[PDB]
Amino acid sequence: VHGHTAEAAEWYVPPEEYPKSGGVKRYLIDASMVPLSIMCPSYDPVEYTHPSVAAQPVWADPADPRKIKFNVKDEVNGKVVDRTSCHPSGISIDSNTGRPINPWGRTGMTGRGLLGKWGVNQAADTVVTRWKRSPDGSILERDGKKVLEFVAIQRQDNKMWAIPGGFVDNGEDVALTSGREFMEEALGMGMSAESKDSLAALFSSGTIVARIYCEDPRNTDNAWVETTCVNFHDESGRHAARLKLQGGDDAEHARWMMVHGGLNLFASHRTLLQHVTSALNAYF
């Protein structure tokens, strides 16, 4: 009908203006030149580092990446950090400068961006879901499938709606990160006696649905975000109904949002929601 239109697998190309860099622009590349298997000799990326990252906080790796081991769990200052990439080939280390090389393609920008750790920045996202129900108690049904509903926060930095989540701190696991990020972002201040135990009841059953590479605009050639997605589903809906949603920390507003395929969310969160609906045979 069409005639072999709209490629084969449309790759990811980050936007031209780097976020929060004061107008610093990357080196623009076409989507058929992005992968690392392809040679692409006309490639001159720009090296840019944020002043916040260059000021050396606690969550930032050192500026000289020598002696650091990638693709394995590495101990920095006695705290475990998981530098394992979800890419099957793994992460390759450049011999000239010691910087890691992104296996998921070119992003038109070298150096360490807004991300504090060289290589894989492991992020954890928390998708707290419940079935979308009418006042009568009947489950809403669209396209012959049951309809989901998830907690979404409006980000402070770019005012786009997104799934709550954040970078894994040093010496902590994905469990703590997921719970801590949900209480900090979606809930703000944190939980009333049994209501808190009820939330614990909500938090006792989580399934890792995906561990994928993020289409995050802050990604560079030497620092990229890879996410582990944890779904907390409330089958009965009792625990979900006791949550008092109120935006805190780096989130402006938080709300319950119906899950569908036309959602315009930050980074690759639509893929994460697709994985959640694929696992629970829900509408998407």
Binding site: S134, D136, S138, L140, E141, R142, D143, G144, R255, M257, M258, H260, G261, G262, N264
Partner: protein, 431 residues
């Protein structure tokens, strides 16, 4: 005889002071050309007499940079002059938006909109704010309020028309002269080049927003929104927007309305953007079986066949905006003939009132105006169960007082039954 003094309401909201007409009206400005920014004082204000209409409608040409509170004071001063100081204050602001171009609606649907809008307007003494021009939904709204101006005596609810000055036929005739123009004849069929848009003869008051441009649309939305918000804060009354048919800009207008917390009532079955909004709301929220086959793909197909965008990104943006409008189910109320009923449009308006942000006592007063006891019973029972007993006791006296005043005996019996002592009544004013 031309008026020389006006009763302008104080900023404290306690009484009206008498001041000279030239002193009050000096604060409104007009722009002679687009280049001009500061402007000059408005020489275009007075009253227009339309053919086959007994009463005259006041008009004020004011700039885009002018304060909407001042325009609100002007409308209050006109009403205070015509109906006395103790005129019926509005408990509802009805903003009517939609299609600029002419359209034809089904007779049953038109009858339903007319019946619901007339009852709502007569029960709440509502201010109806439209575009003011003699085409489409504004002309249609004028036809619904014409019967109100014919069938009812004493107080007539205002039909304020806020329009851009650069497209209006007869602007030069209104501008030239010595203000006020008492009973000026308006010739809607006269060719004032390049204007081809006449003013609706059934609107009771006109605010002509001027920015110096000619034959440019869309200049009055922000001032209109600011005026509605200012009126809503001043009379402590909720603002309800009603969306009938509408084009692409109506979607952005509705988006602005739902972003600012103002509830909307979308008339389903009127076609175009209203059908798109109704389809989107029914897809996202309605639990009935006939909406289970609704899909986002069919919604995209409907938007593409109806609006016909040039680019896919435009279609994506319109679809995204439409889905963003109906995110909060409380702020959108969809009226449909096959679901609600012919005499259920005022119930939809009351549903929008109850879904808005306001105090319960005020909501009970609105429920008392529309004569919906069951709604009041359900609200009181829900408030009683949820531990909100203090607000019930704080507002029961004023609600009982309002019930005695507006001749609602069932409501009198209901408020007296919930432990409200008859001999503990207090007057609204201080003796």
């Amino acid at each position: 005889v031309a008026a020389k003094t006006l009763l302008i309401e104080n900023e404290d909201g306690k009484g009206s002071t008498r001041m000279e007409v030239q002193d009050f009206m000096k604060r409104f400005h007009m722009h002679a050309s687009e280049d001009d920014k500061t402007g000059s004082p408005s020489t275009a204000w007075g009253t227009l007499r339309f053919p086959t209409k007994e009463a005259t409608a006041p008009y004020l040409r004011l700039s885009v940079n002018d304060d909407p509170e001042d325009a609100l004071l002007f409308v209050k001063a006109m009403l205070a002059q015509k109906y006395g100081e103790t005129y019926d204050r509005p408990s509802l602001i009805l903003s009517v938006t939609g299609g600029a171009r002419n359209f034809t609606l089904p007779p049953r649907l038109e009858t339903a909109i007319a019946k619901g809008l007339r009852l709502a307007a007569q029960r709440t003494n509502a201010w109806v704010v439209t575009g003011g021009t003699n085409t489409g939904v504004m002309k249609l709204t004028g036809q619904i309020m014409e019967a109100l101006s014919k069938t009812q005596s004493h107080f007539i609810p205002p039909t304020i028309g806020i329009a851009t000055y650069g497209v209006i036929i007869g602007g030069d005739d209104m501008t030239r002269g010595e203000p006020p123009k008492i009973g000026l004849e308006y010739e809607m069929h006269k060719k004032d080049p390049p204007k081809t848009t006449p003013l609706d003869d059934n609107h009771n008051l006109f605010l002509l927003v001027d920015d110096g441009s000619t034959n440019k649309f869309g200049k009055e939305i922000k001032f209109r929104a600011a005026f509605e918000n200012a009126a809503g804060q001043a009379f402590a009354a909720p603002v309800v927007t009603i969306v009938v048919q509408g084009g692409p800009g109506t979607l952005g207008t509705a988006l602005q309305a739902v972003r600012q917390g103002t509830p909307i009532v979308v008339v389903d079955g009127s076609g175009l953007a209203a059908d798109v909004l109704a389809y989107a709301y029914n897809f996202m929220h309605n639990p009935l079986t006939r909406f289970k086959s609704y899909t986002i793909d069919d919604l995209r197909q409907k938007v593409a066949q109806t609006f016909n965008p040039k680019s896919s990104q435009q279609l994506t943006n319109l679809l995204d905006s439409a889905l963003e409008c109906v995110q909060d189910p409380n702020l959108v109320v969809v009226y449909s003939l096959q679901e609600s009923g012919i005499d259920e449009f005022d119930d939809c308006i009351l549903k929008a009132i109850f879904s808005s942000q306001g105090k319960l006592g005020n909501k009970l007063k609105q429920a008392m105006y529309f004569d919906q006891l069951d709604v009041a019973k359900r609200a009181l029972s829900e408030a009683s169960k949820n531990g909100q007993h203090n607000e019930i006791a704080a507002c029961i006296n004023d609600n009982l007082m309002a019930a005695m005043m507006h001749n609602k005996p069932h409501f009198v019996e209901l408020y007296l039954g919930f432990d409200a002592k008859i001999y503990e009544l207090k007057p609204s004013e201080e003796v």
